[PDB]
Amino acid sequence: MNDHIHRVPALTEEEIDSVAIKTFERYALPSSSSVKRKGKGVTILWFRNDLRVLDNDALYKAWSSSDTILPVYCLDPRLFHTTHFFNFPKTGALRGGFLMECLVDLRKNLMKRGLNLLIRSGKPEEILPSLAKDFGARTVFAHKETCSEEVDVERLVNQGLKRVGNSTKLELIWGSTMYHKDDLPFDVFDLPDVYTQFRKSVEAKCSIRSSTRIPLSLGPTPSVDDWGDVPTLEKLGVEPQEVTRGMRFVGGESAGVGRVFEYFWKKDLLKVYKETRNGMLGPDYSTKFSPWLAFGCISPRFIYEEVQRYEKERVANNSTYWVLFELIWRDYFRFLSIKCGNSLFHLGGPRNVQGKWSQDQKLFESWRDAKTGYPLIDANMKELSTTGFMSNRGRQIVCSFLVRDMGLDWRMGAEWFETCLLDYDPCSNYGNWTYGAGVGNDPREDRYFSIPKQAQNYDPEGEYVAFWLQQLRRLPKEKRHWPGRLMYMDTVVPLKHGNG
Amino acid sequence: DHIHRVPALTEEEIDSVAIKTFERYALPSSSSVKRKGKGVTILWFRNDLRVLDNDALYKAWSSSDTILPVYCLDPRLFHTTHFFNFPKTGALRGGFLMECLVDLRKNLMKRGLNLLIRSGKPEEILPSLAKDFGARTVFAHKETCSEEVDVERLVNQGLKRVGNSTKLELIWGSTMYHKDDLPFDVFDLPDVYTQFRKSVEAKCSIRSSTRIPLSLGPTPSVDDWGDVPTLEKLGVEPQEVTRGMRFVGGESAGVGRVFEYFWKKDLLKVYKETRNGMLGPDYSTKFSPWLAFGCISPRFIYEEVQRYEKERVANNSTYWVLFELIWRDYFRFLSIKCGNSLFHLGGPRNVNGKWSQDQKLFESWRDAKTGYPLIDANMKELSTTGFMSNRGRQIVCSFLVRDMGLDWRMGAEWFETCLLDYDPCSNYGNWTYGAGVNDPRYFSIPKQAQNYDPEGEYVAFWLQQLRRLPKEKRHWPGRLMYMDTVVPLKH
DNA sequence: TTTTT
DNA sequence: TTTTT
Ligand SMILES: Cc1cc2nc3c(=O)[nH]c(=O)nc-3n(C[C@H](O)[C@H](O)[C@H](O)COP(=O)(O)OP(=O)(O)OC[C@H]3O[C@@H](n4cnc5c(N)ncnc54)[C@H](O)[C@@H]3O)c2cc1C
Ligand SMILES: Cc1cc2nc3c(=O)[nH]c(=O)nc-3n(C[C@H](O)[C@H](O)[C@H](O)COP(=O)(O)OP(=O)(O)OC[C@H]3O[C@@H](n4cnc5c(N)ncnc54)[C@H](O)[C@@H]3O)c2cc1C
Ligand SMILES: Nc1nc(=O)c2c([nH]1)NC[C@@H]1CN(c3ccc(C(=O)N[C@@H](CCC(=O)O)C(=O)O)cc3)CN21
Ligand SMILES: Nc1nc(=O)c2c([nH]1)NC[C@@H]1CN(c3ccc(C(=O)N[C@@H](CCC(=O)O)C(=O)O)cc3)CN21
Ligand SMILES: [Cl-]
Ligand SMILES: [Cl-]
Ligand SMILES: [Cl-]
């Protein structure tokens, strides 16, 4: 396989810059004298989880409705407080570091287009109105978000701008999804409660829009005395962390488009994606696009166009389709977050299921700290805390284990994923947790995963567990799955099914 | 005949009062706001059938040099109810709607505009008009519930299909407190009304009503402004009010009733004392039918309350009218938070109980043959007038759910057919609340009869056979004097 | 019913 | 906890 730490993408920094230039050139708006800018005044572009220049409608609209743009990112102190119910760190060190890399790359890429990124630490509803006043901005453009916390910030910013006068308007633009909200065959209040019904409808009745093309010249900015430093984690009360084993994701749009190139074109792996996507070990088994999608470093419309080109130039098969099937799951949970609102975060979930659930700290800590006694579980939980990533197969398994085998309040698992995952997204995280916990609005199915069966089918040689739990390396297949207590450790709970 | 027009003003008195109200609130001139070169716009009316305090109308006017107002008679409005298939719009509300449209056209014409009336789906009508007239924009008020928001989607996509350029602009209205001014996003709306009320009263201001110029013209050149469709064309047999309150449709009549209730009769200052009554126009504002169609707005009502508090009296009753309008806002915002759970058997909380849909039981409730005078008189008033007292609505809801054990949506859908003031937010909001399937309650029929109809005058008015009887037997008559009871009382 | 003893 | 045995 290779026992080195695996950079994602694995491209050299010079390969990344070359691919980035070619990609930006391929999708560039071939000049635009037709767009009228003169006399349109100053605008502020407020970045959140859309840290890219490519295929960015908020940026396009800001540019087309102004003569001067002030791009701004606010490091919101609330991002580094604690989680809602159980008070874990709101943002763990690994995602914190990924965010900083995203910001460094965004500033660099904006500079290539005649702009810069203003960085400030503080609450957007305090920073943005002050900037709008100082620079005389007519508008603040930003992407629309869906969940409670984010929409509350939108309200506070809008009310803040109002409080300094009329004129300055907050303009929120839909983004994030492969299928556009406005193009759906239903309002989101009537979103089907079954995914298959949603997928069939959009596939039959909708089209995917082309990527928005962005000009190579986006300047000028206003005259700014201090563009601000990239913040450091220590200032935010977070101890920096470096990956010591496994995958080391690299933040930013440049690296993100680099990974699309790497996975699709250089390694030619898209043609077998459906075959390998239930793997757990290494970068090759799946796209690994999720951290870049969560921060908006890349966009699904861009990915879809790359898939289209791959299908023309190389091959179209069930694997080239399945990547889109999975991006449609991302769309679904995004839209479902609007339909469900805060019931997405409640114990009973969307259908308000009753009864039970332990919050035993000792049990939870054994799951969190990879000390359950089941190698399959512990390896996954160790991968998570070490790298900020876990395989899709692993996420499903550790969810079932915590809910069903341990009997724990599922929100303890969801909030720990919120702390740890580079790709943390409230819609996808709480969506999949409620789905896996059996508290979604989807019809009743008892989705119990057998740990022994999962180990045999998806880690048949014990390669995955041996990688993360190196004391198991010397053992053959069967002991890797079931090592026994002295070699490994005690089991904290019995298994509900598939032998105790 | 014992028929009471609401308001009790002649058509000419209504005109006089409306003129004075329009002039009081008129925007004094406005050459300042420039219009020239701004092109054609379409104003799409739905349940906002007024000129006063209309932000959709003002924005359409300020962003254009020419305005085409349109109302579409949507055929889906005259199909059937969702679960139990009663008429989607009953004859009495249908008649009220047509009167509102005639008045709106009149009031728009007096401002140099007109009203284009077409029968059909907005998503088919509006894009065609946009294209033919070269409209840059279609302005309309934003709605909150599934059916209305689906029409918004279909119109938007229909405009995209003719081309880019033509944009649908949806404006928040309807409420006393503005959505954008709330101290929380609607996803975090308090599940208890009292917390909502205390929050908005402490942290929000009520905006001044939007003032409208007296001259709004011109319109485009239009060949046929369209006739008002008859109820018979739409598959509804006309119905007249044969007894009780006869509400008069339109903004003019609505502003007339505000004048009548507040100023002519001076009743606002006792509103809280009288509001649990059931007989006659005097006991409450009776604003609801005009509010439901948007013939009047709560910001205008608040401005009239302020003036009354200055020119007449301020006390607990003058406040209480605002308290109740805040309930209207709450259910509107709750419709967004709850979505379609507002219409489901289990409600927002998804309660799992057991509920009969027995057709025989439901019909004795519907047709005022329960054998309980208080219940039957209220149900008769509803079917005869399209209105029922607030006190009555609470009682008949309690009776249907708890004494008869019926699926509450049967009663909610019957209200949807009959009520002049039908509003999905307020109706299904109040039914879920009353049925105990709300976000956060039994009525004793005998107690209610004694406390809110002591002399039996209400039941006697609607139930002719009780009129001869003394109050003792008006409360509890019996089989021979009235009829048998279809179910016993739970308590 | 995406992925599930 | 609008009105509530
Ligand atoms: C308990 C649990 C929690 C999860 N939390 C998150 C989360 O916080 N953020 C997140 O992005 N995904 C989450 N997922 C979904 C999924 O596991 C990850 O998106 C996936 O593992 C990322 O790896 P990849 O990019 O190589 O995925 P691929 O298999 O290559 O899929 C391609 C893309 O499709 C999307 N996708 C794939 N599967 C899902 C899915 N199950 N739900 C939604 N989108 C999907 C992602 O954008 C992903 O990048 C969660 C799943 C579970 C079971
Ligand atoms: C089962 C049930 C169903 C209802 N259905 C509707 C409906 O479809 N449409 C509707 O407008 N009202 C509905 N209501 C609320 C209320 O009964 C009526 O608004 C009221 O009777 C109208 O009479 P009024 O204008 O004279 O009220 P007033 O006592 O004079 O109150 C003034 C205004 O405040 C508002 N208001 C008062 N009470 C309520 C309330 N409980 N909920 C919301 N707003 C209120 C109304 O806009 C009303 O016009 C319902 C109540 C119940 C119990
Ligand atoms: N990025 C992100 N955005 C979020 O909105 C979010 C997360 N992450 N992670 C988990 C938290 C928890 N979420 C919650 C959980 C509960 C309520 C809630 O119950 N609110 C009440 C109203 C206010 C109150 O009384 O607390 C409700 O009735 O909905 C809201 C948001 C928001 N969640
Ligand atoms: N004016 C008005 N507007 C409405 O939206 C409305 C009324 N009146 N009167 C009652 C009906 C019933 N309402 C309903 C009831 C159920 C769903 C519903 O359950 N929809 C599904 C998705 C579509 C489906 O599967 O049927 C859902 O999951 O929410 C929607 C609207 C809309 N209601
Ligand atoms: Cl976008
Ligand atoms: Cl308005
Ligand atoms: Cl009467």
Tab-separated table of C-alpha atoms in Angstrom, chain B residues 192-324:
chain	number	residue	atom	x	y	z
B	192	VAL	CA	-45.276	29.433	23.790
B	193	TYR	CA	-47.252	32.501	22.639
B	194	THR	CA	-46.613	34.455	25.861
B	195	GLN	CA	-42.817	34.285	25.294
B	196	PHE	CA	-43.323	35.401	21.673
B	197	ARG	CA	-45.577	38.319	22.726
B	198	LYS	CA	-43.315	39.497	25.575
B	199	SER	CA	-40.288	39.350	23.241
B	200	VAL	CA	-41.852	41.381	20.388
B	201	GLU	CA	-43.440	43.937	22.784
B	202	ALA	CA	-40.104	44.479	24.548
B	203	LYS	CA	-37.722	44.361	21.540
B	204	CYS	CA	-39.696	45.437	18.419
B	205	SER	CA	-41.366	48.539	17.044
B	206	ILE	CA	-44.502	48.390	14.913
B	207	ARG	CA	-43.739	50.146	11.628
B	208	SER	CA	-45.778	53.118	10.426
B	209	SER	CA	-48.204	52.184	7.648
B	210	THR	CA	-46.876	52.766	4.132
B	211	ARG	CA	-48.442	55.914	2.664
B	212	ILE	CA	-49.694	55.742	-0.919
B	213	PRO	CA	-49.982	58.647	-3.403
B	214	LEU	CA	-53.435	59.609	-4.742
B	215	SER	CA	-52.118	59.388	-8.335
B	216	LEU	CA	-50.603	56.030	-9.337
B	217	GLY	CA	-51.270	55.964	-13.116
B	218	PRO	CA	-50.829	55.156	-15.896
B	219	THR	CA	-51.528	51.543	-16.835
B	220	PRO	CA	-50.613	50.091	-20.227
B	221	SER	CA	-53.166	50.142	-23.021
B	222	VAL	CA	-55.337	47.059	-22.370
B	223	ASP	CA	-58.028	45.784	-24.770
B	224	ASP	CA	-60.115	43.900	-22.190
B	225	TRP	CA	-59.735	44.505	-18.447
B	226	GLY	CA	-61.945	41.445	-17.931
B	227	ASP	CA	-65.328	40.803	-16.368
B	228	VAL	CA	-65.968	39.544	-12.868
B	229	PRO	CA	-66.685	35.820	-13.112
B	230	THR	CA	-70.012	34.594	-11.708
B	231	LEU	CA	-69.985	31.914	-9.005
B	232	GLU	CA	-72.063	29.725	-11.343
B	233	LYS	CA	-69.266	29.674	-13.976
B	234	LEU	CA	-66.941	28.403	-11.223
B	235	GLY	CA	-69.348	25.597	-10.221
B	236	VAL	CA	-70.714	27.284	-7.084
B	237	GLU	CA	-74.412	27.979	-6.524
B	238	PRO	CA	-74.873	31.517	-5.137
B	239	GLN	CA	-76.060	31.717	-1.531
B	240	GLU	CA	-77.531	34.646	0.379
B	241	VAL	CA	-77.502	35.375	4.111
B	242	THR	CA	-81.061	34.770	5.366
B	243	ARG	CA	-80.441	35.645	9.047
B	244	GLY	CA	-77.705	37.223	11.213
B	245	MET	CA	-74.598	39.083	10.066
B	246	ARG	CA	-74.159	40.017	6.394
B	247	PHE	CA	-70.524	41.042	5.810
B	248	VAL	CA	-69.898	43.442	2.884
B	249	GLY	CA	-66.795	42.716	0.798
B	250	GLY	CA	-64.018	45.171	-0.004
B	251	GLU	CA	-61.516	47.656	1.391
B	252	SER	CA	-64.123	50.441	1.508
B	253	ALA	CA	-66.464	48.385	3.709
B	254	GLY	CA	-63.495	47.237	5.850
B	255	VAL	CA	-62.302	50.766	6.629
B	256	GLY	CA	-65.977	51.586	7.236
B	257	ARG	CA	-66.181	48.934	9.959
B	258	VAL	CA	-63.022	50.264	11.646
B	259	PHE	CA	-64.760	53.680	11.650
B	260	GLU	CA	-68.047	52.197	12.896
B	261	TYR	CA	-66.589	50.070	15.706
B	262	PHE	CA	-63.926	52.502	17.014
B	263	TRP	CA	-65.344	55.957	16.315
B	264	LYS	CA	-69.102	55.936	15.597
B	265	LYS	CA	-70.030	53.543	18.416
B	266	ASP	CA	-67.056	54.120	20.781
B	267	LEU	CA	-66.871	50.372	21.528
B	268	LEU	CA	-63.091	49.854	21.379
B	269	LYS	CA	-62.809	51.004	25.024
B	270	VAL	CA	-64.959	48.043	26.213
B	271	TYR	CA	-63.704	45.454	23.695
B	272	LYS	CA	-62.046	43.218	26.332
B	273	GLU	CA	-65.259	43.184	28.450
B	274	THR	CA	-67.508	42.127	25.536
B	275	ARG	CA	-65.281	39.972	23.279
B	276	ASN	CA	-66.524	36.572	24.585
B	277	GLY	CA	-70.110	37.295	23.443
B	278	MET	CA	-71.879	35.348	20.675
B	279	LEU	CA	-74.933	37.383	19.538
B	280	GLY	CA	-74.825	40.471	17.277
B	281	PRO	CA	-72.204	42.699	15.618
B	282	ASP	CA	-71.412	44.897	18.676
B	283	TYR	CA	-69.455	42.462	20.932
B	284	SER	CA	-66.150	42.479	18.955
B	285	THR	CA	-64.373	44.204	16.065
B	286	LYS	CA	-65.566	41.760	13.380
B	287	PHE	CA	-62.453	42.785	11.388
B	288	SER	CA	-61.486	39.191	10.500
B	289	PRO	CA	-63.050	38.783	7.044
B	290	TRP	CA	-61.377	41.978	5.806
B	291	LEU	CA	-58.048	40.988	7.410
B	292	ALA	CA	-58.182	37.517	5.796
B	293	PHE	CA	-58.543	38.991	2.280
B	294	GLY	CA	-56.084	41.824	3.051
B	295	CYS	CA	-58.780	44.490	2.569
B	296	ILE	CA	-57.345	46.092	5.711
B	297	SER	CA	-53.957	45.681	7.413
B	298	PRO	CA	-52.855	45.520	11.077
B	299	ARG	CA	-50.400	48.466	10.767
B	300	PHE	CA	-53.328	50.684	9.731
B	301	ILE	CA	-55.435	49.272	12.593
B	302	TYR	CA	-52.611	50.040	15.052
B	303	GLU	CA	-52.445	53.658	13.772
B	304	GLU	CA	-56.223	53.970	14.317
B	305	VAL	CA	-55.845	52.497	17.839
B	306	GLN	CA	-53.119	55.068	18.615
B	307	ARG	CA	-55.406	57.889	17.440
B	308	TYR	CA	-58.352	56.520	19.498
B	309	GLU	CA	-56.095	56.304	22.567
B	310	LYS	CA	-55.340	60.023	22.015
B	311	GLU	CA	-58.767	61.341	20.941
B	312	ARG	CA	-60.986	59.090	23.157
B	313	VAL	CA	-59.498	56.708	25.813
B	314	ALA	CA	-56.608	54.313	26.489
B	315	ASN	CA	-57.178	51.322	28.795
B	316	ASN	CA	-56.970	47.504	28.918
B	317	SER	CA	-59.498	47.101	26.077
B	318	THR	CA	-57.630	49.354	23.624
B	319	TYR	CA	-54.491	47.336	24.362
B	320	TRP	CA	-56.378	44.007	24.106
B	321	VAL	CA	-57.235	44.490	20.416
B	322	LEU	CA	-53.436	44.609	19.825
B	323	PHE	CA	-52.955	41.527	22.059
B	324	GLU	CA	-55.323	39.629	19.737
